[PDB]
Amino acid sequence: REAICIHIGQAGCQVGNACWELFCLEHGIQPDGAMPSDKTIGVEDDAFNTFFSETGAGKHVPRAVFLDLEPTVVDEVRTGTYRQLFHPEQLISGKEDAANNYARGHYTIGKEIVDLCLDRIRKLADNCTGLQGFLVYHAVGGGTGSGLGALLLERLSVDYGKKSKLGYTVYPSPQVSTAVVEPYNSVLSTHSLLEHTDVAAMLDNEAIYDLTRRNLDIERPTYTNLNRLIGQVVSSLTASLRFDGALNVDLTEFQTNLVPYPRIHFVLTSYAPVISAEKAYHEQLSVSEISNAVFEPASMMTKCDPRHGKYMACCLMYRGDVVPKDVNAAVATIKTKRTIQFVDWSPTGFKCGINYQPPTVVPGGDLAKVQRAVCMIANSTAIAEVFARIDHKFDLMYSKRAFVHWYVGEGMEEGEFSEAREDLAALEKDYEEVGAESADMD
């Protein structure tokens, strides 16, 4: 029943703003924290409970924390439209940023703020009766997102136990870039995140910009569009807990079906009916068409091509007016294709889910209104190319000690670079060996 959301840093807080806007409009909680006048004890109305808790006066408040080291974005939330929705204690802000240094966030500044975060999460977890996981939003490219996200996941992993941790992560794009030190922060973040996360979903802004240019008709997209697409995908994955359906899927089922070996937990995500209102009237949108859509790499939100690897497992979530025979026929048609290949040790490659609630439409949004949608998260060996490309840039920079004095000055041993780089080399070797056919292995 309950799930707690943790939002970290700039991308994570802005995506949180889009997500809670969506969850409010889908359940019907007004921006001032009030159920509409037509809802009473006359009918059973509890679906919000997965994301909201009600006070004794009947106000709703959401099960989320917003974490930042700079005040500006949380002060924008405090002064914005949803001022009365959030409890003021939930919006925690420090004085100064981690300045793109993972070392500054982890060692110098996040250690001061971390105890307040654990106390707030504990205060939330005490007001629950069926918590079944944490959802985490952060970027690994920046200093506070990487450092405080790693430190907080380590502390949560020590305090809590046998609880799932699912991450939605914005990785550095392969040629679009925002800062020079991106490789160092991404390597050290992925090194800490590898041991303490159960499934990690990867997003790339360059891919979602391509998707908004290609599918929608937006010539000059901005982060609010990207954040609305991310909100739709998270709403689709968590819809299985909140509404009636033929085949529900608990968050623990994702880790069981998608992860074959404990280090192989990075998955691709895609969404099918990303379409504009003008295109929506030229096409029918049947189950088989959107099922065919989720497998094209042009539909993915991470810049990787799955044709350079082999799939090990796929999880398909259908929501809306769908009939099981069409889901079965669609999955059977995909399996026939020769350019889609699965490793020979994974014969039963699919997991299915079917939910009746169609996706909600947001007043200023750019997606059309549709009766059905499908969302996919999948595990594939193609991910080795993403790490290989980050590692080449790391090797280029570290060969000349390009920026190391900053990291050593803020408290970190230089040895940590070599340890993380060796761990990523071993992860590359795992992805090389796992893809080897069994017939050649004898």
Partner: protein
């Protein structure tokens, strides 16, 4: 002679809701529990599935078990949900995660004592207890693990009754879960030792029933669960209404199982026909027999033409002569003689019941014991061997605590079962 039902997991609870709707309709029980039937013949055997409550109410002899209450909350909120006794819902606080080891060892042992307490309270209340009936899927997590745990405990506690199971098994073409081979193999290993008779259903076969026979444009899980509820309520129909040739679950088991390991059967139900076609064919015993043996009407992927029938049983509902039933079963055995095992002189048992289901003049349910079921087990064992050589996803099961020797034993036992079917298929008198 009353049966106690157990519904486990999402598939089991959903099929159970439709079963109790069909049974409540046939005996004229309002969803409030009040009797509103239209013949005394309905009341005189109501005890078989219902227990009697004091005022104007009836309560169903069923135990509902699940690890997360989501499905139970959906069925309790349904239109017939009120009939169920509140104390009969047993639930934990975290899901099985579709993992057999978690469902069998950690939350299973936590809830099993409370489930056994409810099952014993229901069993010791009966004046004479007939077998238990269990519905669950084999590919899931709480269904497989807690269903087989409870089956093992009831076989220790009630070894003299009958144990009957309805089970959902993985389709040969598309998987619904990535880890189905492990859960299926361990569950079949537990069932072949514990069960007395087990029926297996492929969702793919029900899809073919819906598309080819009923030509439904937009079928839903309610239709598949209605077909299953129809056959399950049909096998027991002769237990609870008068007839010219009575039959019973124990008598069916005695006539169907030649050797204790050979207890896996196929099922079918005959008067399935599309809304356009009914004007073209009147009901008669030859038409029912022809649909009864058509593989299009069989609920498993294996086809009879690759195997042989050791035994089969047909239960007829309706007002009909015994001569046409007997001669139809003789004619089918004589005309298709190569598909029947020759060292048994007559493979089909017939039974006749006077009262058909409402709105049908006649109906028959078919149960078949055919060696072609070995190919399904062979396919599952192959996929298991492919996954185990590479230790596929194995760390979840090993992390819960299972010894790998369990996996090698279950695979070896199932492989010996396929070999045993193959040897009896090609046996000869010499």
């Amino acid at each position: 002679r009353e049966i106690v039902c157990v519904q486990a997991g999402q598939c089991g609870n959903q099929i159970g809701s439709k079963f109790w709707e069909v049974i409540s309709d046939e005996h004229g029980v309002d969803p409030t529990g009040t009797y509103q039937g239209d013949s005394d013949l309905q009341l005189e055997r109501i005890n078989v599935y219902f227990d009697e409550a004091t005022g104007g109410r009836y309560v169903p002899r069923s135990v509902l078990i699940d690890l997360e209450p989501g499905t139970m909350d959906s069925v309790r909120a349904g239109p017939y949900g009120q009939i169920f006794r509140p104390d009969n819902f047993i639930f934990g606080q975290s899901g099985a995660g579709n993992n057999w080891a978690k469902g069998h060892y950690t939350e299973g042992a936590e809830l099993i004592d409370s489930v056994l307490d409810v099952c014993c309270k229901e069993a010791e209340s009966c004046d004479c207890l007939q077998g238990f009936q269990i519905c669950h899927s084999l590919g899931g997590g709480t269904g497989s693990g807690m269903g087989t745990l409870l089956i093992s405990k009831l076989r220790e506690q009630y070894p003299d009754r009958i144990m009957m199971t309805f089970s959902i098994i993985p389709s040969p073409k598309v998987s619904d879960t990535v880890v189905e081979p492990y859960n299926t193999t361990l569950s079949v290993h537990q069932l072949v030792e514990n069960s007395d008779e087990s029926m297996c259903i492929d969702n793919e076969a029900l899809y073919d029933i819906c598309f080819r026979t009923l030509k439904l444009t937009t079928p839903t899980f309610g239709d598949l669960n209605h077909l299953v509820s129809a056959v399950v309520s049909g096998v027991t129909c002769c237990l609870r209404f008068p007839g010219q040739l009575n039959s019973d679950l124990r008598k069916l088991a005695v006539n169907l199982v030649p050797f204790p390991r050979l207890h896996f059967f196929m099922m079918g139900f005959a008067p399935l026909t599309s809304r356009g076609s009914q004007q073209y064919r009147g009901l008669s015993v030859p038409e029912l027999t022809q649909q009864m043996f058509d593989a299009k009407n069989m609920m498993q992927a294996a086809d009879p033409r690759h195997g042989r029938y050791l035994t089969a049983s047909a239960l007829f509902r309706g007002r009909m002569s015994t001569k046409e039933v007997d001669e139809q079963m003789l004619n089918v055995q004589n005309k298709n003689s190569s598909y029947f095992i020759e060292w048994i002189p007559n493979n089909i048992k017939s039974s006749v019941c006077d009262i058909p289901p409402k709105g049908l003049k006649m109906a028959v349910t078919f149960i078949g014991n055919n060696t072609c079921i070995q190919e399904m087990f062979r396919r599952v064992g192959e996929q298991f061997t492919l996954m185990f050589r590479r230790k596929a996803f194995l760390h979840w099961y090993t992390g819960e605590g299972m010894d790998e020797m369990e996996f090698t034993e279950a695979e070896s036992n199932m492989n010996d079962l396929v070999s045993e079917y193959q040897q009896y298929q090609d046996a000869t008198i010499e």
